[PDB]
Design a protein around this nucleic acid. Structure first.
Ligand SMILES: [Mg+2]
Ligand SMILES: [Mg+2]
Ligand SMILES: [Mg+2]
Ligand SMILES: [Mg+2]
Ligand SMILES: [Mg+2]
Ligand SMILES: [Mg+2]
Ligand SMILES: [Mg+2]
Ligand SMILES: [Mg+2]
Ligand SMILES: [Mg+2]
Ligand SMILES: [Mg+2]
Ligand SMILES: [Mg+2]
Ligand SMILES: [Mg+2]
Ligand SMILES: [Mg+2]
Ligand SMILES: [Mg+2]
Ligand SMILES: [Mg+2]
Ligand SMILES: [Mg+2]
Ligand SMILES: [Mg+2]
Ligand SMILES: [Mg+2]
Ligand SMILES: [Mg+2]
Ligand SMILES: [Mg+2]
Ligand SMILES: [Mg+2]
Ligand SMILES: [Mg+2]
Ligand SMILES: [Mg+2]
Ligand SMILES: [Mg+2]
Ligand SMILES: [Mg+2]
Ligand SMILES: [Mg+2]
Ligand SMILES: [Mg+2]
Ligand SMILES: [Mg+2]
Ligand SMILES: [Mg+2]
Ligand SMILES: [Mg+2]
Ligand SMILES: [Mg+2]
Ligand SMILES: [Mg+2]
Ligand SMILES: [Mg+2]
Ligand SMILES: [Mg+2]
Ligand SMILES: [Mg+2]
Ligand SMILES: [Mg+2]
Ligand SMILES: [Mg+2]
Ligand SMILES: [Mg+2]
Ligand SMILES: [Mg+2]
Ligand SMILES: [Mg+2]
Ligand SMILES: [Mg+2]
Ligand SMILES: [Mg+2]
Ligand SMILES: [Mg+2]
Ligand SMILES: [Mg+2]
Ligand SMILES: [Mg+2]
Ligand SMILES: [Mg+2]
Ligand SMILES: [Mg+2]
Ligand SMILES: [Mg+2]
Ligand SMILES: [Mg+2]
Ligand SMILES: [Mg+2]
Ligand SMILES: [Mg+2]
Ligand SMILES: [Mg+2]
Lengths: 93, 46, 271
RNA sequence: AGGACCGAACCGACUAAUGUUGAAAAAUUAGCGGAUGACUUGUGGCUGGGGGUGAAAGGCCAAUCAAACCGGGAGAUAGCU
RNA sequence: GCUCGCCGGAAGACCAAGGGUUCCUGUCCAACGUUAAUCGGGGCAGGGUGAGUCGACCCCUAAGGCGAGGCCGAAAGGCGUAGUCGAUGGGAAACAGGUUAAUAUUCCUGUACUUGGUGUUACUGCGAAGGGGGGACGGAGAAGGCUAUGUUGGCCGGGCGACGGUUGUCCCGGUUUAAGCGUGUAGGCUGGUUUUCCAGGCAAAUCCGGAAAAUCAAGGCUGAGGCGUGAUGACGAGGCACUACGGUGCUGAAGCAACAAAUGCCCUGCUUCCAGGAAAAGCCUCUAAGCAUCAGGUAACAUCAAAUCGUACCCCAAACCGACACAGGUGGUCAGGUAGAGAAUACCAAGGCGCUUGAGAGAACUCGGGUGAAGGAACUAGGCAAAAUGGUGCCGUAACUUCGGGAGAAGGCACGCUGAUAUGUAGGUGAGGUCCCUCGCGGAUGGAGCUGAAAUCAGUCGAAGAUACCAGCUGGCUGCAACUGUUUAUUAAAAACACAGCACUGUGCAAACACGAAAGUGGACGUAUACGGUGUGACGCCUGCCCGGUGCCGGAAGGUUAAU
């Protein structure tokens, strides 16, 4: 499971937005870009160890990259995993 | 009026799919040709 | 029983039913059934190999004791049943050690009858036993054709065979066809005629009738075009052919048997 | 009870007009037949080109079929224009 | 923003398939949009899809596909065993409310349920790839009990009328509440427990099956809905405050009854018929190899677990199939009011729209409609097209017939409203009360209230009461086909094909026949009352003569005759 090698590689970025931000006030939830493969399990562990905060539960979803055809030839941004992580009640960083 | 192309992904991947070409001599022979032409798109996929 | 229907509607007016009140109502006996899948007439290449077959009612197959091996153990007929797979009816028969089997219902069989098999069994309707021990002259159905194999001759509604001469180690049967055939005397066989025989008195009466028995229409070659069938096209009702099978072989006459291997066993062809 | 009657859905396609560089490479509008049956329909399967399937019209087999489409023999041959 | 009109079994809403960001916000207008466009499904940038219990994966199998070995085939390869795959079908569990610009049975609030691991504890025979059960099955029709839903009343909040009247028998609105848990109802099926023994269930069985007794009759299984809880709650007009005027916060009445009532549910029922109506796992049980103070098995409690992938948006369409923002095509689900038999139809509700060039003119002619003096098929190939008929009840109805039909033959009469019988009838429904009792969702009694056609008598308005939409024209002679069906997708729907019925002819089963160099397979898990081929085409009365020719069958003494 740890694989702290793995635990370090699982978390990529915070993800900013209106939604992501009310989700932190209103529902003590934090929103991150995590590895594509990452499990809710793996995501839980990581957030605990690295962000030192207790973790109520983890939700995930997969985001489909948008496409942007510029004349004949087309391109595709890639798919990433989003993680809505709730933070118990001991709400800190 | 009802036209001749009524799509269905399962039926697609089944009759013209990659593995369907890998199944048989002449289907594999297709794949070769397309590779000889250097085709960007061997089969149709996800 | 055979019933005529009143003409409340054409294609009904001509209907002649065959309704047998001593027939079990509802489902058969579950454990003696199995799948049976329809075939459209088509073999394992996808090609219709036999014309005119398809649709019509779904059918479960009842396993049926064609060999009749349970020697010694008596059994009673529990009930008579309709079997959608044959023109005959069948008997649900309960053996004295608790085993159950289906058999072809012979002519008179009722619920609460004893039947039995083995070389000894009473010469009575329902009883099976090798032919060496059956009185020459008896009328007999469901006749084995090799010892131990199982029923092959006289299986259809209203049919029978009659042993007309033992001699040798073979018998000589008058088959319902009219043919007279030899067959070894250790071939098992059953006393009786096979059951219901008002069968032939049905009339169907309308088209859907045959349809729901899985019979699709037959197209007369004379209504086809020459590319299809040897019976040409015409130009408003012509014939002028010597009548043939769609594959250019003669109907109306030509003998088509050919065996030699079994030629020995035939004593008189039918007529 | 019924391949029963009338009539929507549903399946069909008898008549007329409109349309005919169409709203449409077969339809619109008014009328029309079947509508518990040989009815109708979704999903998947099977049959392959002198081959399939055909309640038989030479119908249908991807806007086509008296022998599909694709590639090859191939620059077939053309005493014809 | 106010009005007007249109759809409303859809032109509303939700899925599936299919699309693949079209979803939401900002911003821009070249090109795309049949016009302009500041707008857009267009450009650009950003945001957006949150699940143990929705679906998929998964377990299981259908048709069918693949298929170690194998069988067959010049090579390629074809078939096929064990097996292994394959949903369109079987298999555990979640609901109401709230919320976002855009997700929600996934987030939040409330309240649950499933099945595994661990643990503790009490209690116990546990134990398959096997046996048994079960899962597990068609069509039609019948009517009862329900619910979804609706109408009225009551109840609550609000109203007192732009113009004669409106404090009342007046007006308007609302009156909503899930799973889960408890109760076992209307109603469906079946008699139970015990003991003994047995050629069956590939071995075994306490199970199933079979045979015997003994014994008590009430026993069990299934099961809509109701009621209760869930709900101290949610929701609820409206208030009251704030407001960037978009909204936000706070608060919050009544929240019942009667009657009507599906096509939904009881119902995988019941009755009934002939064409006789999948499989396998899950699940219950039985034991075998086994393991026997173990492991297990059942239960309570606690506890952990339930991964991964899908979820935006279009959906009978501007996002799919049609080259188009195309009058076409596309499976499933939901069903409000009045009139109505109705899912027709007309008008409305909820909701969605006015179809992406418009402005004027009021010519011919064309397309689509309305009315038409007198005549009434004189038109025309032909009544093509129009016009006409059109409902319900009662009366009434020819030839002919296979006695069913013909038949809605034809042809009449009635039809609105108001009063009376009866201030609302017959019918339906059914509360209080009285009594009974195995007292329950019970039985008998009782008729309040509610709802409610139809008929006659009398009166009355109009030219007209089936007043609109809607909705057969009728009759006579004759050809052909018995009939329902099928067919030329796109100029032929017919007398053509089919058909039930009839006949001939092949076929003894390793059937004939058919697909196959072959293996293998259909015919068929059939067996001559069966299967194939050919012609005929219900049925009534019938179906004569000809075997020279040509086909076929039988035959044979001769003659002629191949390889050798
Ligand atoms: Mg997910
Ligand atoms: Mg025929
Ligand atoms: Mg026939
Ligand atoms: Mg023809
Ligand atoms: Mg030929
Ligand atoms: Mg002629
Ligand atoms: Mg009918
Ligand atoms: Mg009709
Ligand atoms: Mg036509
Ligand atoms: Mg039409
Ligand atoms: Mg298909
Ligand atoms: Mg075509
Ligand atoms: Mg050719
Ligand atoms: Mg070519
Ligand atoms: Mg050449
Ligand atoms: Mg050339
Ligand atoms: Mg406006
Ligand atoms: Mg785009
Ligand atoms: Mg423009
Ligand atoms: Mg938009
Ligand atoms: Mg855009
Ligand atoms: Mg959660
Ligand atoms: Mg092999
Ligand atoms: Mg194979
Ligand atoms: Mg599987
Ligand atoms: Mg499925
Ligand atoms: Mg939405
Ligand atoms: Mg435990
Ligand atoms: Mg089993
Ligand atoms: Mg109700
Ligand atoms: Mg006034
Ligand atoms: Mg959605
Ligand atoms: Mg729509
Ligand atoms: Mg448009
Ligand atoms: Mg369109
Ligand atoms: Mg309508
Ligand atoms: Mg406009
Ligand atoms: Mg007129
Ligand atoms: Mg006139
Ligand atoms: Mg006049
Ligand atoms: Mg006149
Ligand atoms: Mg004239
Ligand atoms: Mg004239
Ligand atoms: Mg006309
Ligand atoms: Mg008219
Ligand atoms: Mg004439
Ligand atoms: Mg006809
Ligand atoms: Mg017809
Ligand atoms: Mg045509
Ligand atoms: Mg026959
Ligand atoms: Mg004929
Ligand atoms: Mg004759």
């Amino acid at each position: 499971m740890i694989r702290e090698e793995r635990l370090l590689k699982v978390l990529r970025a915070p993800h900013v937005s209106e939604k992501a931000s009310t989700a932190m006030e209103k529902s003590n939830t934090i929103v991150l870009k995590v590895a594509k493969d990452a499990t809710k399990a793996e995501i839980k562990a990581a957030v605990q160890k690295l962000f030192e905060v207790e973790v109520e539960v983890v939700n995930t979803l997969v985001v489909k990259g948008k496409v942007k055809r510029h004349g004949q030839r087309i391109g595709r941004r890639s798919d990433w995993k989003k993680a809505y992580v709730t933070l118990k009640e001991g709400q800190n960083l | 009026m009802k036209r001749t192309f009524q799509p269905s992904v399962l039926k697609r991947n089944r009759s013209h799919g990659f593995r369907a070409r890998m199944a048989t001599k002449n289907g594999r022979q297709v794949l070769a040709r397309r590779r000889a032409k250097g085709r960007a798109r061997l089969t149709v996929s996800k | 029983a055979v019933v005529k229907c009143k003409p409340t509607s054409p294609g009904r007016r001509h209907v002649v039913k065959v309704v047998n009140p001593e027939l079990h109502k509802g489902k058969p006996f579950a454990p003696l059934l199995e799948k049976n899948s329809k075939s459209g007439g088509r073999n394992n290449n996808g090609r219709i190999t036999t014309r005119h077959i398809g649709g019509g009612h779904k059918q479960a197959y009842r396993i049926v004791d064609f060999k009749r091996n349970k020697d010694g153990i008596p059994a009673v007929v529990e009930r008579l049943e309709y079997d959608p797979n044959r023109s005959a009816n069948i008997a649900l028969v309960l053996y004295k050690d608790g085993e159950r089997r289906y058999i072809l219902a012979p002519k008179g069989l009722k619920a609460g009858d004893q039947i039995q098999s083995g070389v000894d069994a009473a010469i009575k309707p329902g009883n099976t036993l090798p032919m060496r021990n059956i009185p020459v002259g008896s009328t007999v159905h469901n006749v084995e054709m090799k010892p131990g194999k199982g029923g092959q001759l006289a299986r259809s509604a209203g049919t029978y065979v009659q042993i007309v001469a033992r001699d040798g180690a073979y018998v000589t049967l008058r088959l319902r066809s009219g043919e007279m055939r030899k067959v070894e005397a250790d071939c098992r066989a059953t006393l009786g005629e096979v059951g219901n025989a008002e069968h032939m008195l049905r009339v169907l009466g309308k088209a859907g009738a045959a349809r729901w028995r899985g019979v699709r229409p037959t197209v007369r070659g004379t209504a086809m075009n020459p590319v299809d069938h040897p019976h040409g096209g015409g130009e408003g009702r012509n014939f002028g052919k010597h009548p043939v099978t769609p594959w250019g072989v003669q109907t109306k006459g030509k003998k088509t048997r050919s065996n030699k291997r079994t030629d020995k066993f035939i004593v008189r062809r039918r007529s």
